Amino acid sequence: MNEIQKNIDGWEGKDIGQCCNEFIMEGTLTRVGAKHERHIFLFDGLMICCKSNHGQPRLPGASNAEYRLKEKFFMRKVQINDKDDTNEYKHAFEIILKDENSVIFSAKSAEEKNNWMAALISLQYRSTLE
């Protein structure tokens, strides 16, 4: 949370570093829904999306959370759906995470795209097996 506290906001949650906080997957996905980006961070406890659009003051006031940790407790059952055509589109797909919510991630790394969906498919996979 120390190396993450400088990329979150209100560090939501009641002590996670003790419950886990083991960032399963570390990566930043863009939300193709209004030119918006956020540093995604699926924790072994839940999913946390660190919003990222602009900066904020109070930098010299001990801080550096340019982003904003967004509560996303669905990793326990996600559903990524790489619904894109790059060749025809940019580089984003639909993400169907628990709590019935669809997103529009935007990756630029063939690996990230795979690690983006693989990571999600990793947990979502534990929602029936393992």
Explain what this protein looks like in three dimensions.
The strands form two sheets. Strands 1, 2, 3, 4 and 5 form a five-stranded antiparallel beta sheet that branches. The protein has one helix at 110-124; strands at 23-26, 29-31, 36-43, 47-52, 68-72, 80-81, 93-97, 101-105. Strand 3 and strand 4 form a beta hairpin. Helix content is 12%, strand content 29%. It has one domain (1-130): PH-domain like, CATH 2.30.29. The protein starts with 22 loop residues before the first strand and ends in a 6-residue tail after the last helix. It is built from one helix and eight strands, in the order E-E-E-E-E-E-E-E-H. It has 130 residues and is mostly beta strands.
For the record, the CATH architecture stands as Roll
CATH level 3 topology: PH-domain like
Tally of strands: 8
Counting H and I runs of at least 4 residues, what is the number of helices? Answer: 1
Which structural class matches the secondary elements?
Answer: mainly beta
Query: What is the percent of helical residues?
Result: 10-25%
**What percent of residues are in strands?**
25-35%
Choose one word for the global shape. globular
Radius of gyration based on Cα positions:
15 Å
* Helix-strand topology string: EEEEEEEEH
CATH H-level name... which superfamily?
A: Pleckstrin-homology domain (PH domain)/Phosphotyrosine-binding domain (PTB)
Largest sheet: 5 strands, antiparallel
Subunit structure: Interacts (via C-terminus) with GRB2 (via SH3 domain). Forms a complex with phosphorylated MUC1 and GRB2 (via its SH3 domains). Interacts with phosphorylated LAT2. Interacts with NCK1 and NCK2. Part of a complex consisting of ABI1, EPS8 and SOS1.
Protein name: Son of sevenless homolog 1
PDB class: signal transduction
Keywords: signal transduction, SOS, pleckstrin homology (PH) domain
